[PDB]
Amino acid sequence: GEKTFTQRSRLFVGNLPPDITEEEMRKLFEKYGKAGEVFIHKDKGFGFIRLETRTLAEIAKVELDNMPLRGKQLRVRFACHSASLTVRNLPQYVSNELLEEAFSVFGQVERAVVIVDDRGRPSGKGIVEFSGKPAARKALDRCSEGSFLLTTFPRPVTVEPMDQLDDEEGLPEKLVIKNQQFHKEREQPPRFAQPGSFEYEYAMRWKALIEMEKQQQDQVDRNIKEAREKLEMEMEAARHEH
């Protein structure tokens, strides 16, 4: 069981021929069933196409990612989510479906996921993707001004905009801005710094700062755990009343 014509099945198609038509692009993705939202930018050579299911979009992406057409090699990638939110400070005992139910009060939720580790235990963060931007704006606003509780325990969740990161295409060398700082940084190739050299001293002092920052961050963790446990005891003590 899946949801159809969601933003997660919407593909960005770049490096198109300049004379491309809506019918020409619909014939390209003919194999992958019917298409919905079809956008095409006359100049710049790019557009969007929404396929019925995410599995169909995943197949179309791999089968056409660098397929050459009219001399140019196409660029097929998943389009960025305009209504994605990150939810932290999740309760212990949470689920994807609990988030889908909770955030559905703000608008149509396309997908909600509880981020888990290699052992299946939640990491404390979650993702909530809405159908459209105003529903995500409503959730962001209401959850900051009010206290959104998902479970019996009265611990409000933290709802923030999603910081979208690309760990797939990343930063290719062709895309790096070749400015003065770039050429300065590239004068020296990757190497191990020699003990007693200027670079060695500098790098060891940098390592010291990176380690000092980790110790300072560990201290914040200690302060919040100590304060959290004081509040958790007070909450447990107050329940014995009224």
């Binding site: 300065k184 940084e185 191990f192 710094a193 200027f198 790098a203 060891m204 390592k207």
Partner: peptide, 13 residues
């Protein structure tokens, strides 16, 4: 040790 990728001596972690 200290591994450097660019001219600036910032070690990779």
């Amino acid at each position: 040790g200290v591994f450097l990728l660019t001219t600036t001596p910032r070690p990779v972690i």
